[PDB]
Amino acid sequence: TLFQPTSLGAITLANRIVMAPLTRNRAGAGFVPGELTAGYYAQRASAGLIISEATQISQQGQGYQDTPGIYTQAQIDGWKKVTAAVHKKGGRIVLQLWHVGRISHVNLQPNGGAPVAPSAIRAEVKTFVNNGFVDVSEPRALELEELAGIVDDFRKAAANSIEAGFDGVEVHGANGYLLEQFAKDGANMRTDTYGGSVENRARLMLEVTAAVAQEIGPERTGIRISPVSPANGISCSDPQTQYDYIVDKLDALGIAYIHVVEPFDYGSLRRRFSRTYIANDLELATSHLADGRADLIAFGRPFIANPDLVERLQSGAPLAEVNAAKIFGGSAAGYTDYPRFSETTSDN
């Protein structure tokens, strides 16, 4: 059941509830975790496993303002306090490694340069920059030569995550960012070895996960994927073929887990992968687990508004709704001031 302990690769989890990666845009100077962030995560450490907010491996890979990094010592040292705070509550925390690719803005990029991508095709989405929402910039298609360098930024970012006391990492292979831009033909128009087929489109994602897995162990490596894009995501002519291939290859690398943002056949992916499946509601989630479809279930917004989400799912206490206006940016308010259940109600 949802509330009983389990293991993920090496580590041991108090329960099967995962806190999904949620961007909050509250990092400080130098993309170092802001001073309240340790608290934020420790408040939610009753989660079996926390996946951190997406965290850029380089400034090139930054796409939203005030998201944190994992590439300078300042950031590492900021993260140590957070891993410590989580661990002192008996918790687990994995860092989600990020490269946004074309989902960025010149204002965030080194020297005002153009964001990078497999092909020079702008995304039709906005980002949060200069304290407002603006269309993402036109990207530059990456030279074949640069790719090994990006694989190495992930490699190095994984070893920085271990320095910082994380229990492992999660490669961000989803939600329209760099590695998915390569994976999906809606955005990968290349004709070299990193495009033009299932196997080529899939090459960067697999190279990145293979390098991360070698650096730190497959047992501390996970990846997130999202086979079916939303309406305004990346077009993908045949995601089933694409993601059956990718999961076959991921399973071959021996990695601890896949994290799937869920007409598509997930049972195929589930079958192909021989370790943990993290799927991304209490009672359907329970059936989903009972049914053998997943091993862990990741909840997103509910963890924003209910720090005691695990306890409330277990007791039946009603859940607090999110203040949506305070998710991204700002202060303690709508971040660390969400009450636990006893501090929410009036008897009369």
Residue numbers in the entry: 5 to 266, 277 to 294, 298 to 365
Authors' description from the paper:
The structure is the first published apo (FMN-free) form of OYE. The electron density map was interpreted starting at the fifth residue for the whole protein except for two loops (G267—A276, and N295—F297). The flavin mononucleotide (FMN) was not observed in the electron density. The XdpB structure revealed that the putative FMN binding site of one XdpB molecule is occupied by the C-terminus of a symmetry-related XdpB molecule (labeled by *) arranging XdpB monomers into infinite linear chains. In XdpB, FMN is replaced by side chain atoms of the symmetry-related Asp364* and Asn365*: the position of the C-terminal residue of the symmetry-related XdpB, Asn365*, is fixed by hydrogen bonds to the active site residues Tyr181, His176, Gln100, and Arg228; the interactions are depicted in the Figure C in S1 File as a Ligplot+ schema. The Asn365* side chain atoms are stabilized by interactions with Gln100 and replace hydrogen-bonding FMN atoms N3, C2 and O2. Asp364* is stabilized in its position by hydrogen bonding with Arg318 and partially fills in the position of the aromatic flavin ring. The rest of the putative FMN binding site, which would be occupied by ribitol and phosphate, is occupied by five water molecules. The observed intermolecular interaction between two XdpB molecules prevents the binding of FMN and we therefore propose that the interaction may represent a mechanism of self-inhibitory regulation of the XdpB activity.
Members of the Old Yellow Enzyme family (OYEs) are NAD(P)H dehydrogenases containing noncovalently bound flavin-mononucleotide (FMN). OYEs 3D structures adopt the highly conserved (αβ)8 TIM-barrel fold with a closed, central β-barrel. A characteristic feature of OYEs is the β-hairpin lid formed by the N-terminal amino acids and a well conserved FMN binding site formed by the C-terminal edges of the β-barrel.
